[PDB]
Design a protein around this ligand. Structure first.
Ligand SMILES: Nc1ncnc2c1ncn2[C@@H]1O[C@H](COP(=O)(O)OP(=O)(O)OP(=O)(O)O)[C@@H](O)[C@H]1O
Lengths: 202, 202, 202, 202, 202, 202
């Protein structure tokens, strides 16, 4: 990453490398993996972003869809930012320079530490996260329409499932409740908070 | 977080990220999780606060009630602190800027490091903790009225349960004791410390 | 804690938080937990002291006796140190300011880093340790009078039990020995070291 | 490695040493091991590169093929860069100096920290990675021609295998699909993204 | 400990505390525990030395013999170094000040950082190690006279036992060997190295 | 060790201590332990080198052979470097000063940080490694002459054994192959690389 002592390059730590690889193994593409990726890549150069993605051993169908999303975002960058060099001067980054495939570590450090910065790590991280969200939505196993409260399922457990499914995918909470809790909820009237709905069905 | 070398931004550590995620998995919303959250988010920007909350994989009913509490506190902030910008100058934070949804990391660092600081991380952390306490009270399984000493339960074990329940929820200790220890406690008179009550029933 | 770079505030580390919580879970109130608490809270502000105590999930009977001891020590502080403020000036700490309930982190840092320091963390830590020792003595299961060497128990194992019990609670070692080792010990005469007693009964 | 405080030598950390040794034990020469090696050897001197390779306990057939690749690359270096010394002056590195066998740590630090740097660690790391890729291709158990979707294998699982095999080794995805998904894929027409192919066969 | 940034006090780390406690639990008073204690207490003040010893939960017979050795060494210090104070000046340390029982942390830091240092931590560590060696010799289960090679025990395994026992306790290696290896060893003549003895009996 | 902030003494870390002790327990004197020892003792003073060797609990036959090798190397040092002191001046190191038995930590730091350095840690580490290699060769269980490919053993697995044995101990690879792979290898002609031999017998 690039961090403060002036703004300097540091080696990606063995601990960050290991944390990312373990979250992916333990959680696959459950939605919470995305804000973990984002937090573990704080300050990341594009090189570091490629290291984290390249160190994942399975999920190669997912990694391949991610390259497609990366190439689409890169081509849209080249559309808005054509390039045309000057000895000892900085070249403008193209899509593939941002994605880390045709830029060196030194070019990346030079863009990221310029005054003002050309923030190639934050740009690439936005493309990667966009790709990762399409994958989370892909691998979401259930429609929110099939999250229905069981006859003897505690309301809380049902709400946990309902919002878990809705996060992976993205009135109806009440409709999908079981008869008994549904009746209690119809009676609360409009404008009930989730806290009030969950207290009523306890 | 923001910490001292002057006051600088540091990346949230893999170790803090991991600690928070594990305490939540192992303890759910037992009350002791709150002072752990508070301690692990020392110096946190609002961005970091959102990272810790977003990295929790289950308990999405709880996370949703928390957003409601956050939005209520944010709307009360906008009520007391309306906003109306000046080139190169700091804008005043609204509720949603404090909660980290419409403020950038740079705005957050600028508020938090101003002289005097606009402490957006400490403000948001107070809203989050308020939300978390309502959740601890929600998920508290037992009324203190149903904590009663068993016929052969050691007094200490009963007191542990009584104060555990009372912490999750928030004369009667003696009333809820078993006949034998109850008799010993009635005899101590008024003004007995817990230490004396527990010595008597040993 | 407060530590040296001048004397600065640092966030309590995830590793200290975790160490304290694990020693308590694994050892309860065996006496050795006290010097661990003392060592893990080196440099602690009163806020940090409250964090370590608040993060303990069970033993709420013990935590409650501890508050009683804290309030007693605080009331004795107010007896010896009454307070009576001056813009931009430091107020004198009362008992509850020392215990961290009515003082802010900033007041605590200001007392602890003053020339000369008002060492509010070391004062509160002494109250806490006093409370913790009363708890260690409470939860000590056995009188030293019931530590007696078994007919075929190795002398060393018996001495380990004898001093373990005596530490939790706080001529007789010989009296409580088994007939055979007792006879060997009577013969050594007065003025035998523990090393000599233990060599004789090997 | 060599890292920034000026550019200084630091001891390879016990944590890097241990991470490398564990990834090799747990993953052998699955392709993802290569970008892990590259990331764990950030800043590495040739000495450090030899330490990481020498600390691997099995796979000695692989380590021996790696020496062959190293010697070939070293001989090609000597072909393009003959050497011919001046008191207190730097000698030019030969192949075996780059590979760390006839250069000392001090010569290595002197090349790597010169203005401009003679980047002996990055040169040797490129040779090592080249050798490691030939080993990944060697130990790849399956041809992509034998990755065929099973009659009841979910399409995603098949794509994971297909791209896993293709990474170890390096129209046909559709050909190798099962009849039912093959028919759906023929109908999509040309120019389907992987995301669209995978949605269709869900 | 006291370490270099000038010479400053640092908090004993949770990791040192934990390492010491685990080596004692896993190894008791096997001899190798002594050089581990010595290495984990590098820079230790007497306070830190007491923390490491006080955090050990069992072996209280051993801890008590250790106090006896400490008091003997302290009384011998007072015999050679009597004391007789000057405002703002350093007092001379007595035995019990060195052992950490009547000296404060500040006195300890003042002795240890004086020009020239009064090295109270290194003095106390020598007393502790002396005590620890008497304990290692106490708990040594076997005389070297009962280490004899078994009829089918590999010579190496026997030598491992022989030197293990001799380290806990502190011509005969050959005498204690089995008939067959004994005969081979008699034939080597005088002046055989251990390497040659062990090669001969392979 | 001695490391850079100028060149300063640092305490050997609990993590290095623990890593060395675990590699020895898990790997004994498999050859890869040597470059791990060398890497974990980067910057080591002779004191640190003795700490790492003294903290090993078993293998005391091996530790004793190591002392013999150390004493031989030390006597050869005294043969080439006799000594003959000057107030406030540095004495010349003898063999036993280098090995850490008659030199203090301060003498060691003074030799190692002199301009030019008298590198007593690197000298002693070379003696130790020499001793360790004689031990690796001792404990090598098999001659390379008894590494022969089994009738149904994959060629790779056989090559792994062949080079594992050859590393512990230090045309024939082909001779020791099984009939079928032997025939394929005879046909390749002279000048086949290991990669080509291993491809042919796949
Ligand atoms: N949640 C946890 N609970 C218990 N132990 C943990 C946890 N997380 C990490 N550890 C311990 O810490 C190890 C990983 O981190 P480590 O202890 O090596 O810290 P470190 O990197 O040395 O700290 P620093 O970088 O500050 O020196 C693990 O092997 C484990 O023993």
């Amino acid at each position: 990453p690039i961090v403060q002592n002036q703004m300097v390059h540091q080696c990606i730590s063995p601990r960050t490398l290991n944390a990312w690889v373990k979250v992916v193994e333990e959680k696959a593409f459950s939605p919470e993996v995305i804000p973990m990726f984002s937090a573990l890549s704080c300050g990341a150069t594009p090189q570091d972003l490629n290291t984290m993605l390249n160190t994942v051993g399975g999920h190669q169908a997912a990694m391949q869809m991610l390259k497609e999303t990366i190439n689409e975002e890169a081509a849209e960058w080249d559309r808005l930012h054509p390039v045309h060099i000057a000895p000892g001067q900085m070249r403008e980054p193209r899509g593939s320079d941002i994605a880390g495939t045709t830029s060196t570590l030194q070019e990346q450090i030079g863009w990221m530490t310029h005054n003002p910065p050309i923030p190639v790590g934050e740009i690439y991280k936005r493309w990667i996260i966009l790709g990762l969200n399409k994958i989370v939505r892909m691998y979401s196993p259930t429609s929110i329409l099939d999250i229905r409260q069981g006859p003897k399922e505690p309301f809380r457990d049902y709400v946990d499932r309902f919002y878990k499914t809705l996060r992976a995918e993205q009135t109806l909470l009440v409709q999908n409740a079981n008869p008994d809790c549904k009746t209690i909820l119809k009676a609360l009237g409009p404008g009930a908070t989730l806290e009030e709905m969950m207290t009523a069905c306890q």
